Ligand binder design. Structure first.
Ligand SMILES: *[C@@H](C(=O)O)[C@H](O)C(=O)N[C@@H](CC(C)C)C(=O)NCCCCNC(N)=[NH2+]
Ligand SMILES: [Ca+2]
Ligand SMILES: [Ca+2]
Length: 322
């Protein structure tokens, strides 16, 4: 029941292209440099050199919209500073209700495929349907911006494009606020917490939020804008949005420890402290908890004790829904 952004009708356009024997080309967000950017990604820029617009059906013999469900590992940041957005999309996948709204089902590259897709966002004070053609920025046959751990999966790349479309261009997405993305996917209420002055029952607040299906994100502030994308010695990225994906407690050497799980939208580069994938701490806990919580995989997701979490991170944003 969403309203058509710019008046473009997904079903009518798809049927029309199928009848006319052609693939959709978006006049509202065309496959040209103006859709990429205006400065760092403008036509006269080095970052756009070699960038060509290609459809998934031109790159692979078997492109798929969704493979093994739409999940957080499907969100791997590319050469665009839109971590705030990607962390939001990753969190979104943990609430099927909202995911199913933002990403309509029944879309594929097989039957009825006409080079057009659509998504719904909370914009201009309402739920709007945004259409996009599947021409994506590529370099040497690979996606330049967001991509999935599954090489033949494209829903996340297409959603990022629709979000870029409503904002004017991909470059417009460089630099942002996680809460802004949370609201565009939920129309809900956002709150934030200063981890340097965190409430005594903040962990409980997180537990309930995660249970209700709220979206949570966190980040580490920097002294200035020069320490951009600076990795700490503990291997955390500062000035970078992370998705908070879980909160569980474990019994460590006789007493339970509050743990928190988060994911770097890069899909790699994880924390190297206690509770990390190859950390020793997992030996001092019971097998059940270890096998049920620990996952040894370079996926950008990792656990931290809540104690270390509030010391290392500076901000936590939470978006609660209906
Ligand atoms: C994220 C990345 O891709 O690594 C990138 O650093 C980013 O978006 N940085 C943000 C902060 C994180 C989301 C904590 C940033 O530096 N924002 C300040 C941008 C100021 C304009 N902001 C908004 N929110 N419209
Ligand atoms: Ca997937
Ligand atoms: Ca991991």
């Amino acid at each position: 029941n969403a309203i058509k952004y710019l008046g473009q009708d997904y079903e009518n356009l798809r049927a029309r292209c199928l009848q006319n024997g052609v693939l959709f080309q978006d006049d509202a967000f065309p496959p040209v440099s103006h859709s990429l950017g205006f400065k760092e990604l403008g036509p006269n820029s080095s970052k756009t050199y070699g960038i060509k617009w290609k459809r998934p059906t031109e790159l692979l013999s078997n492109p798929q919209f969704i493979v093994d469900g739409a999940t957080r590992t499907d969100i791997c940041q590319g050469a665009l500073g839109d971590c705030w957005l990607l962390a939001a999309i990753a969190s979104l996948t943990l609430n099927e209700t909202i995911l199913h709204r933002v990403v309509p089902y029944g879309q594929s590259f097989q039957e009825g495929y006409a080079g057009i897709f659509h998504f719904q966002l909370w914009q201009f004070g309402e739920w709007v349907d945004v259409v996009v053609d599947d021409l994506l920025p590529t370099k040497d046959g690979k996606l330049v911006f967001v991509h999935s751990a599954q090489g033949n999966e494209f829903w996340s790349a297409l959603l990022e494009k629709a979000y870029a479309k409503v904002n004017g261009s991909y470059e417009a997405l460089s630099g942002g606020c996680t809460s802004e993305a949370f609201e565009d996917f939920t129309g809900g209420v956002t709150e934030w917490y200063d981890l340097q002055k965190a409430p005594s029952d903040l962990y409980q607040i997180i537990l309930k939020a995660l249970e209700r299906g709220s979206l949570l994100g966190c980040s580490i502030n920097i002294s200035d804008i020069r320490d951009l994308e600076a990795i700490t010695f503990k291997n955390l990225v500062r000035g970078h949005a992370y998705s908070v994906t879980d909160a569980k407690q474990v019994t460590y050497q006789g007493q339970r420890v509050n743990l928190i799980r988060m994911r770097n939208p890069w899909g790699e580069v994880e924390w190297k402290g206690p509770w990390s994938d190859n950390s020793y701490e997992w030996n001092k806990v019971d097998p059940y908890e270890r096998e049920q919580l620990r996952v040894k995989m370079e996926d950008g997701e990792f656990w931290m004790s809540f104690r270390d979490f509030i010391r290392e991170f500076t901000k936590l944003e939470i978006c609660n829904l209906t």
